[PDB]
User: What shape does this take?
Amino acid sequence: PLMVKILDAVKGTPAGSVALKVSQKTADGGWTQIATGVTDATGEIHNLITEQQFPAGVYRVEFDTKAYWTNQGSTPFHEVAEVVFDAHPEGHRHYTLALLLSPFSYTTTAVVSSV
Amino acid sequence: CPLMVKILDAVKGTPAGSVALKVSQKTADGGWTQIATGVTDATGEIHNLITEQQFPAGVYRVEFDTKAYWTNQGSTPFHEVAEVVFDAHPEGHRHYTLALLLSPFSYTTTAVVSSVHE
Amino acid sequence: CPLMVKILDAVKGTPAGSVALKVSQKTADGGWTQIATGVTDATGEIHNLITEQQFPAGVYRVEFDTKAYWTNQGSTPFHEVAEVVFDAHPEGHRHYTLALLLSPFSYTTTAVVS
Amino acid sequence: CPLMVKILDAVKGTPAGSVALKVSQKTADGGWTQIATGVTDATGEIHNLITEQQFPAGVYRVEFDTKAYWTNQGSTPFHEVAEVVFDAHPEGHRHYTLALLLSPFSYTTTAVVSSV
Assistant: This one.
Protein backbone atom coordinates (compact mmCIF):
# COMPACT_ATOMS: atom_id res chain seq x y z
CA PRO A 1 0.00 0.00 0.00
CA LEU A 2 3.03 2.27 0.53
CA MET A 3 5.57 2.38 -2.32
CA VAL A 4 8.43 4.74 -3.09
CA LYS A 5 10.23 5.71 -6.28
CA ILE A 6 13.41 7.73 -5.87
CA LEU A 7 15.07 9.33 -8.89
CA ASP A 8 18.46 10.98 -9.21
CA ALA A 9 18.08 14.20 -11.21
CA VAL A 10 21.80 14.47 -11.85
CA LYS A 11 22.28 10.98 -13.34
CA GLY A 12 18.89 10.29 -14.90
CA THR A 13 18.62 6.98 -13.08
CA PRO A 14 16.83 5.75 -9.95
CA ALA A 15 18.54 6.46 -6.62
CA GLY A 16 19.79 3.14 -5.32
CA SER A 17 20.68 2.26 -1.73
CA VAL A 18 18.71 5.08 -0.15
CA ALA A 19 17.99 4.35 3.52
CA LEU A 20 14.52 5.19 4.79
CA LYS A 21 12.26 4.71 7.79
CA VAL A 22 8.50 4.80 8.09
CA SER A 23 6.88 6.11 11.26
CA GLN A 24 3.25 6.34 12.31
CA LYS A 25 1.94 9.26 14.39
CA THR A 26 0.72 8.41 17.90
CA ALA A 27 -2.15 9.92 19.91
CA ASP A 28 0.06 12.27 21.94
CA GLY A 29 1.68 13.57 18.76
CA GLY A 30 4.71 11.30 18.97
CA TRP A 31 6.03 8.72 16.48
CA THR A 32 6.35 4.96 16.35
CA GLN A 33 8.62 3.23 13.82
CA ILE A 34 6.79 0.70 11.67
CA ALA A 35 9.46 -0.13 9.07
CA THR A 36 12.94 0.60 7.76
CA GLY A 37 14.62 -0.31 4.48
CA VAL A 38 16.97 0.61 1.66
CA THR A 39 15.95 1.20 -1.96
CA ASP A 40 17.03 -1.40 -4.47
CA ALA A 41 18.75 -0.44 -7.75
CA THR A 42 15.39 0.68 -9.19
CA GLY A 43 14.88 3.25 -6.41
CA GLU A 44 12.07 1.18 -4.91
CA ILE A 45 11.42 -0.94 -1.80
CA HIS A 46 9.17 -3.94 -2.24
CA ASN A 47 6.98 -5.24 0.56
CA LEU A 48 7.88 -2.22 2.69
CA ILE A 49 4.89 -2.75 4.99
CA THR A 50 1.57 -4.64 4.88
CA GLU A 51 -2.08 -3.64 4.62
CA GLN A 52 -2.85 -4.29 8.32
CA GLN A 53 0.33 -2.47 9.30
CA PHE A 54 -0.85 0.59 7.34
CA PRO A 55 -4.17 1.82 8.80
CA ALA A 56 -5.55 5.36 8.61
CA GLY A 57 -3.38 7.97 10.32
CA VAL A 58 -0.50 10.38 9.79
CA TYR A 59 2.76 8.88 8.52
CA ARG A 60 6.28 10.11 8.16
CA VAL A 61 8.79 8.68 5.73
CA GLU A 62 12.36 9.80 6.39
CA PHE A 63 14.86 9.46 3.50
CA ASP A 64 18.59 9.55 4.22
CA THR A 65 19.44 11.70 1.22
CA LYS A 66 22.56 13.19 2.82
CA ALA A 67 24.21 9.78 2.89
CA TYR A 68 23.12 9.13 -0.70
CA TRP A 69 24.82 12.30 -1.95
CA THR A 70 27.94 11.75 0.17
CA ASN A 71 28.29 8.27 -1.33
CA GLN A 72 27.92 9.74 -4.85
CA GLY A 73 30.66 12.32 -4.16
CA SER A 74 28.53 15.45 -3.75
CA THR A 75 27.89 17.59 -0.72
CA PRO A 76 24.16 18.05 -0.31
CA PHE A 77 22.13 20.75 1.28
CA HIS A 78 19.50 18.78 3.14
CA GLU A 79 20.30 16.76 6.26
CA VAL A 80 17.36 14.45 5.39
CA ALA A 81 14.22 14.49 3.29
CA GLU A 82 11.00 13.95 5.24
CA VAL A 83 7.59 13.24 3.72
CA VAL A 84 4.71 13.67 6.18
CA PHE A 85 1.11 12.86 5.18
CA ASP A 86 -2.38 11.62 6.23
CA ALA A 87 -3.10 8.12 4.93
CA HIS A 88 -6.59 6.79 4.14
CA PRO A 89 -5.92 3.25 2.85
CA GLU A 90 -9.54 2.06 2.89
CA GLY A 91 -9.95 -0.76 0.37
CA HIS A 92 -7.63 -0.47 -2.62
CA ARG A 93 -5.99 2.93 -2.02
CA HIS A 94 -2.24 2.54 -2.61
CA TYR A 95 0.33 5.30 -2.06
CA THR A 96 3.42 6.01 -4.13
CA LEU A 97 5.87 8.56 -2.78
CA ALA A 98 7.91 9.84 -5.72
CA LEU A 99 11.08 11.69 -4.82
CA LEU A 100 13.34 13.52 -7.25
CA LEU A 101 16.78 14.31 -5.88
CA SER A 102 19.44 16.90 -6.64
CA PRO A 103 22.24 17.91 -4.20
CA PHE A 104 20.49 21.23 -3.34
CA SER A 105 16.86 20.41 -4.14
CA TYR A 106 14.26 17.72 -4.01
CA THR A 107 10.71 17.29 -5.21
CA THR A 108 8.29 15.12 -3.25
CA THR A 109 5.05 14.11 -4.95
CA ALA A 110 2.39 11.51 -4.21
CA VAL A 111 0.39 9.24 -6.48
CA VAL A 112 -2.67 7.92 -4.64
CA SER A 113 -4.94 5.33 -6.27
CA SER A 114 -8.72 5.38 -5.93
CA VAL A 115 -10.89 2.35 -5.08
CA CYS B 1 9.93 0.43 -26.14
CA PRO B 2 12.77 2.90 -26.62
CA LEU B 3 10.67 5.91 -25.63
CA MET B 4 8.20 5.95 -22.73
CA VAL B 5 6.43 8.74 -20.86
CA LYS B 6 5.05 9.01 -17.31
CA ILE B 7 2.87 12.03 -16.66
CA LEU B 8 1.62 12.97 -13.22
CA ASP B 9 -0.92 15.56 -12.07
CA ALA B 10 0.42 17.39 -8.99
CA VAL B 11 -2.98 18.90 -8.20
CA LYS B 12 -4.88 15.61 -7.95
CA GLY B 13 -2.12 13.21 -6.97
CA THR B 14 -2.91 10.89 -9.88
CA PRO B 15 -1.37 10.12 -13.24
CA ALA B 16 -2.41 12.57 -15.95
CA GLY B 17 -4.77 10.71 -18.25
CA SER B 18 -5.74 11.66 -21.78
CA VAL B 19 -2.81 13.99 -22.35
CA ALA B 20 -2.14 14.37 -26.06
CA LEU B 21 1.44 14.33 -27.28
CA LYS B 22 3.45 14.24 -30.48
CA VAL B 23 6.99 13.11 -31.15
CA SER B 24 9.10 14.77 -33.87
CA GLN B 25 12.61 14.19 -35.15
CA LYS B 26 14.92 16.95 -36.33
CA THR B 27 15.73 16.56 -40.03
CA ALA B 28 18.97 17.15 -41.91
CA ASP B 29 17.82 20.62 -43.05
CA GLY B 30 17.09 21.69 -39.45
CA GLY B 31 13.33 21.27 -39.59
CA TRP B 32 11.10 18.87 -37.69
CA THR B 33 9.25 15.83 -38.89
CA GLN B 34 6.44 14.24 -36.90
CA ILE B 35 6.99 10.51 -36.32
CA ALA B 36 4.29 9.61 -33.77
CA THR B 37 1.25 10.90 -31.93
CA GLY B 38 -0.45 9.47 -28.90
CA VAL B 39 -2.58 10.11 -25.85
CA THR B 40 -1.76 8.95 -22.32
CA ASP B 41 -3.81 6.21 -20.73
CA ALA B 42 -5.11 6.39 -17.16
CA THR B 43 -1.65 5.42 -15.81
CA GLY B 44 -0.17 8.50 -17.50
CA GLU B 45 1.69 6.38 -20.03
CA ILE B 46 1.69 5.59 -23.74
CA HIS B 47 2.57 2.07 -24.80
CA ASN B 48 4.31 1.31 -28.11
CA LEU B 49 4.78 4.97 -29.07
CA ILE B 50 7.60 4.21 -31.52
CA THR B 51 9.79 1.18 -32.31
CA GLU B 52 13.57 0.73 -32.16
CA GLN B 53 13.93 1.18 -35.94
CA GLN B 54 12.12 4.53 -35.76
CA PHE B 55 14.50 5.75 -33.05
CA PRO B 56 18.07 6.08 -34.31
CA ALA B 57 20.42 8.61 -32.72
CA GLY B 58 19.20 12.14 -33.39
CA VAL B 59 17.46 15.14 -31.87
CA TYR B 60 13.86 14.58 -30.85
CA ARG B 61 11.11 16.79 -29.51
CA VAL B 62 8.19 15.50 -27.51
CA GLU B 63 5.37 18.02 -27.25
CA PHE B 64 2.66 17.55 -24.64
CA ASP B 65 -0.70 19.35 -24.91
CA THR B 66 -0.75 20.43 -21.28
CA LYS B 67 -2.85 23.51 -22.04
CA ALA B 68 -5.76 21.35 -23.22
CA TYR B 69 -5.29 19.07 -20.22
CA TRP B 70 -5.70 21.92 -17.71
CA THR B 71 -8.47 23.57 -19.68
CA ASN B 72 -10.36 20.26 -19.49
CA GLN B 73 -9.71 20.09 -15.71
CA GLY B 74 -11.33 23.54 -15.33
CA SER B 75 -8.05 25.24 -14.41
CA THR B 76 -6.07 28.14 -15.85
CA PRO B 77 -2.74 27.00 -17.28
CA PHE B 78 0.37 29.01 -17.89
CA HIS B 79 2.19 27.03 -20.60
CA GLU B 80 0.95 26.74 -24.17
CA VAL B 81 2.61 23.36 -24.38
CA ALA B 82 5.25 21.38 -22.51
CA GLU B 83 8.24 20.66 -24.72
CA VAL B 84 11.00 18.13 -24.12
CA VAL B 85 13.88 18.36 -26.62
CA PHE B 86 16.82 15.97 -26.40
CA ASP B 87 19.54 14.24 -28.35
CA ALA B 88 18.73 10.56 -28.22
CA HIS B 89 21.50 8.00 -27.82
CA PRO B 90 19.75 4.62 -28.15
CA GLU B 91 22.97 2.63 -28.53
CA GLY B 92 23.79 0.09 -25.86
CA HIS B 93 20.07 -0.77 -25.47
CA ARG B 94 19.47 2.57 -23.80
CA HIS B 95 15.78 3.31 -23.31
CA TYR B 96 14.20 6.65 -22.34
CA THR B 97 11.40 7.47 -19.91
CA LEU B 98 10.25 11.08 -19.97
CA ALA B 99 8.75 11.89 -16.60
CA LEU B 100 6.59 14.97 -16.48
CA LEU B 101 5.05 16.45 -13.31
CA LEU B 102 2.23 18.90 -14.07
CA SER B 103 0.73 21.84 -12.19
CA PRO B 104 -1.23 24.63 -13.94
CA PHE B 105 1.63 27.13 -13.57
CA SER B 106 4.55 24.71 -13.42
CA TYR B 107 6.02 21.53 -14.85
CA THR B 108 9.05 19.38 -14.15
CA THR B 109 10.63 17.40 -17.00
CA THR B 110 13.01 14.63 -15.97
CA ALA B 111 14.55 11.86 -18.02
CA VAL B 112 15.33 8.34 -16.85
CA VAL B 113 17.84 6.49 -19.05
CA SER B 114 18.37 3.28 -17.06
CA SER B 115 15.98 1.18 -14.99
CA VAL B 116 18.75 0.81 -12.36
CA HIS B 117 21.25 2.96 -10.46
CA GLU B 118 25.04 2.83 -10.87
CA CYS C 1 18.57 38.66 6.99
CA PRO C 2 20.65 35.45 6.80
CA LEU C 3 17.62 33.15 6.61
CA MET C 4 15.09 33.95 3.89
CA VAL C 5 12.20 32.06 2.38
CA LYS C 6 10.49 32.37 -0.99
CA ILE C 7 7.28 30.38 -1.33
CA LEU C 8 5.48 30.03 -4.65
CA ASP C 9 2.07 28.58 -5.50
CA ALA C 10 2.41 26.40 -8.61
CA VAL C 11 -1.35 26.30 -9.21
CA LYS C 12 -1.91 30.07 -9.28
CA GLY C 13 1.50 31.30 -10.38
CA THR C 14 1.76 33.74 -7.52
CA PRO C 15 3.72 33.76 -4.28
CA ALA C 16 2.05 31.86 -1.45
CA GLY C 17 0.87 34.44 1.08
CA SER C 18 0.03 33.83 4.71
CA VAL C 19 1.95 30.56 5.06
CA ALA C 20 2.80 29.93 8.70
CA LEU C 21 6.26 28.61 9.40
CA LYS C 22 8.55 28.02 12.32
CA VAL C 23 12.31 27.70 12.59
CA SER C 24 13.96 25.31 15.03
CA GLN C 25 17.56 24.65 15.96
CA LYS C 26 18.97 21.25 16.90
CA THR C 27 20.24 21.21 20.50
CA ALA C 28 23.13 19.35 22.20
CA ASP C 29 20.99 16.34 23.21
CA GLY C 30 19.48 15.92 19.72
CA GLY C 31 16.11 17.60 20.25
CA TRP C 32 14.71 20.77 18.73
CA THR C 33 14.30 24.24 20.09
CA GLN C 34 12.00 26.70 18.34
CA ILE C 35 13.80 30.01 17.71
CA ALA C 36 11.29 31.81 15.49
CA THR C 37 7.86 31.76 13.87
CA GLY C 38 6.34 33.83 11.11
CA VAL C 39 3.75 34.07 8.39
CA THR C 40 4.65 34.87 4.79
CA ASP C 41 3.56 38.16 3.31
CA ALA C 42 1.91 38.60 -0.09
CA THR C 43 5.32 38.18 -1.75
CA GLY C 44 5.79 34.73 -0.18
CA GLU C 45 8.60 36.01 2.02
CA ILE C 46 9.23 36.78 5.66
CA HIS C 47 11.54 39.69 6.40
CA ASN C 48 13.69 39.67 9.53
CA LEU C 49 12.77 36.10 10.35
CA ILE C 50 15.88 35.76 12.53
CA THR C 51 19.06 37.77 13.16
CA GLU C 52 22.70 36.76 12.70
CA GLN C 53 22.85 36.50 16.52
CA GLN C 54 20.17 33.79 16.41
CA PHE C 55 21.79 31.93 13.54
CA PRO C 56 25.08 30.29 14.57
CA ALA C 57 26.49 27.20 12.90
CA GLY C 58 24.31 24.14 13.53
CA VAL C 59 21.44 22.07 12.14
CA TYR C 60 18.13 23.79 11.50
CA ARG C 61 14.59 22.82 10.67
CA VAL C 62 12.10 25.05 8.93
CA GLU C 63 8.54 23.73 9.08
CA PHE C 64 5.96 25.19 6.70
CA ASP C 65 2.25 24.72 7.40
CA THR C 66 1.26 23.93 3.84
CA LYS C 67 -1.81 21.90 4.83
CA ALA C 68 -3.56 25.01 6.20
CA TYR C 69 -2.50 26.95 3.10
CA TRP C 70 -4.22 24.47 0.80
CA THR C 71 -7.26 24.06 3.05
CA ASN C 72 -7.70 27.84 2.91
CA GLN C 73 -7.31 27.81 -0.89
CA GLY C 74 -10.09 25.20 -1.04
CA SER C 75 -7.70 22.37 -2.02
CA THR C 76 -7.38 18.92 -0.46
CA PRO C 77 -3.62 18.41 -0.07
CA PHE C 78 -1.38 15.44 0.49
CA HIS C 79 1.27 16.64 2.91
CA GLU C 80 0.62 17.59 6.53
CA VAL C 81 3.55 19.94 6.49
CA ALA C 82 6.66 20.76 4.46
CA GLU C 83 9.92 20.25 6.34
CA VAL C 84 13.33 21.57 5.35
CA VAL C 85 16.24 20.28 7.47
CA PHE C 86 19.80 21.50 6.93
CA ASP C 87 23.25 22.16 8.40
CA ALA C 88 23.98 25.89 8.41
CA HIS C 89 27.35 27.65 8.11
CA PRO C 90 26.29 31.31 8.29
CA GLU C 91 29.46 32.26 10.14
CA GLY C 92 30.47 34.75 7.45
CA HIS C 93 27.47 36.88 6.42
CA ARG C 94 26.45 33.76 4.45
CA HIS C 95 22.83 34.08 3.22
CA TYR C 96 20.37 31.15 3.03
CA THR C 97 17.22 31.32 0.89
CA LEU C 98 14.78 28.43 1.13
CA ALA C 99 12.72 28.30 -2.04
CA LEU C 100 9.52 26.29 -1.88
CA LEU C 101 7.23 25.54 -4.82
CA LEU C 102 3.80 24.26 -3.76
CA SER C 103 1.11 22.13 -5.39
CA PRO C 104 -1.60 20.19 -3.49
CA PHE C 105 0.16 16.82 -4.02
CA SER C 106 3.76 17.98 -4.56
CA TYR C 107 6.37 20.41 -3.35
CA THR C 108 9.89 21.27 -4.39
CA THR C 109 12.37 22.58 -1.80
CA THR C 110 15.59 24.14 -3.09
CA ALA C 111 18.27 26.17 -1.39
CA VAL C 112 20.31 29.10 -2.63
CA VAL C 113 23.37 29.69 -0.49
CA SER C 114 25.15 33.02 -0.92
CA CYS D 1 10.14 45.27 -16.88
CA PRO D 2 7.47 42.93 -18.26
CA LEU D 3 9.54 39.74 -18.69
CA MET D 4 12.06 38.57 -16.11
CA VAL D 5 13.86 35.27 -15.59
CA LYS D 6 15.34 33.59 -12.49
CA ILE D 7 17.52 30.53 -13.09
CA LEU D 8 18.90 28.37 -10.28
CA ASP D 9 21.40 25.56 -10.31
CA ALA D 10 20.07 22.67 -8.18
CA VAL D 11 23.46 20.96 -8.02
CA LYS D 12 25.44 23.91 -6.69
CA GLY D 13 22.77 25.79 -4.76
CA THR D 14 23.42 29.05 -6.58
CA PRO D 15 21.77 30.97 -9.38
CA ALA D 16 22.86 29.81 -12.82
CA GLY D 17 25.11 32.45 -14.31
CA SER D 18 26.01 32.94 -17.97
CA VAL D 19 23.00 31.06 -19.33
CA ALA D 20 22.21 32.15 -22.89
CA LEU D 21 18.59 32.67 -23.87
CA LYS D 22 16.51 33.88 -26.79
CA VAL D 23 12.99 35.33 -26.68
CA SER D 24 10.73 34.87 -29.71
CA GLN D 25 7.16 35.87 -30.44
CA LYS D 26 4.77 33.67 -32.37
CA THR D 27 3.64 35.23 -35.68
CA ALA D 28 0.22 35.19 -37.33
CA ASP D 29 1.20 32.23 -39.53
CA GLY D 30 2.55 30.14 -36.66
CA GLY D 31 6.17 31.15 -37.26
CA TRP D 32 8.51 32.89 -34.81
CA THR D 33 10.21 36.28 -34.74
CA GLN D 34 13.19 36.94 -32.49
CA ILE D 35 12.68 39.89 -30.15
CA ALA D 36 15.59 39.59 -27.73
CA THR D 37 18.64 37.64 -26.68
CA GLY D 38 20.68 37.77 -23.50
CA VAL D 39 22.80 35.97 -20.96
CA THR D 40 22.02 35.68 -17.25
CA ASP D 41 24.13 37.53 -14.71
CA ALA D 42 25.55 35.95 -11.54
CA THR D 43 22.11 36.24 -9.92
CA GLY D 44 20.54 34.13 -12.70
CA GLU D 45 18.64 37.13 -14.06
CA ILE D 46 18.59 39.37 -17.12
CA HIS D 47 17.69 43.00 -16.58
CA ASN D 48 15.88 45.01 -19.30
CA LEU D 49 15.28 42.03 -21.56
CA ILE D 50 12.43 43.74 -23.45
CA THR D 51 10.24 46.83 -22.99
CA GLU D 52 6.50 46.91 -22.28
CA GLN D 53 5.98 48.24 -25.80
CA GLN D 54 7.70 45.13 -27.19
CA PHE D 55 5.50 42.77 -25.08
CA PRO D 56 1.87 42.83 -26.25
CA ALA D 57 -0.43 39.87 -25.63
CA GLY D 58 0.52 36.84 -27.70
CA VAL D 59 2.48 33.61 -27.61
CA TYR D 60 6.16 33.78 -26.66
CA ARG D 61 8.92 31.23 -26.57
CA VAL D 62 11.95 31.63 -24.33
CA GLU D 63 14.74 29.21 -25.25
CA PHE D 64 17.43 28.61 -22.63
CA ASP D 65 20.78 27.09 -23.65
CA THR D 66 20.99 24.70 -20.74
CA LYS D 67 23.04 22.18 -22.72
CA ALA D 68 25.89 24.68 -22.99
CA TYR D 69 25.48 25.55 -19.32
CA TRP D 70 25.93 21.93 -18.16
CA THR D 71 28.64 21.17 -20.70
CA ASN D 72 30.58 24.12 -19.30
CA GLN D 73 30.03 22.80 -15.73
CA GLY D 74 31.68 19.52 -16.80
CA SER D 75 28.41 17.60 -16.48
CA THR D 76 26.35 15.52 -18.88
CA PRO D 77 23.00 17.10 -19.64
CA PHE D 78 19.89 15.42 -20.96
CA HIS D 79 18.06 18.29 -22.61
CA GLU D 80 19.16 19.85 -25.86
CA VAL D 81 17.53 23.13 -24.82
CA ALA D 82 14.93 24.30 -22.27
CA GLU D 83 11.93 25.96 -23.92
CA VAL D 84 9.18 27.82 -22.11
CA VAL D 85 6.23 28.57 -24.37
CA PHE D 86 3.32 30.65 -23.06
CA ASP D 87 0.53 33.03 -24.09
CA ALA D 88 1.39 36.34 -22.41
CA HIS D 89 -1.41 38.53 -21.01
CA PRO D 90 0.29 41.64 -19.68
CA GLU D 91 -2.80 43.82 -19.68
CA GLY D 92 -3.37 45.61 -16.38
CA HIS D 93 0.37 45.89 -15.68
CA ARG D 94 0.96 42.17 -15.25
CA HIS D 95 4.63 41.21 -15.39
CA TYR D 96 6.07 37.73 -15.78
CA THR D 97 8.96 36.00 -14.10
CA LEU D 98 10.07 32.71 -15.65
CA ALA D 99 11.66 30.67 -12.88
CA LEU D 100 13.83 27.80 -13.97
CA LEU D 101 15.40 25.16 -11.66
CA LEU D 102 18.19 23.24 -13.41
CA SER D 103 19.67 19.80 -12.82
CA PRO D 104 21.57 17.87 -15.53
CA PHE D 105 18.69 15.42 -16.15
CA SER D 106 15.74 17.54 -14.97
CA TYR D 107 14.35 21.04 -14.92
CA THR D 108 11.37 22.78 -13.44
CA THR D 109 9.74 25.66 -15.26
CA THR D 110 7.34 27.83 -13.30
CA ALA D 111 5.88 31.29 -13.85
CA VAL D 112 5.13 34.07 -11.39
CA VAL D 113 2.61 36.63 -12.60
CA SER D 114 2.60 39.81 -10.53
CA SER D 115 0.75 43.11 -10.66
CA VAL D 116 4.09 44.57 -9.55
About this structure: Chain D has one domain: 1-116. Residues 1-116 of chain D form a domain with the Immunoglobulin-like fold (CATH 2.60.40.180). The longest strand of chain D covers residues 79-88.
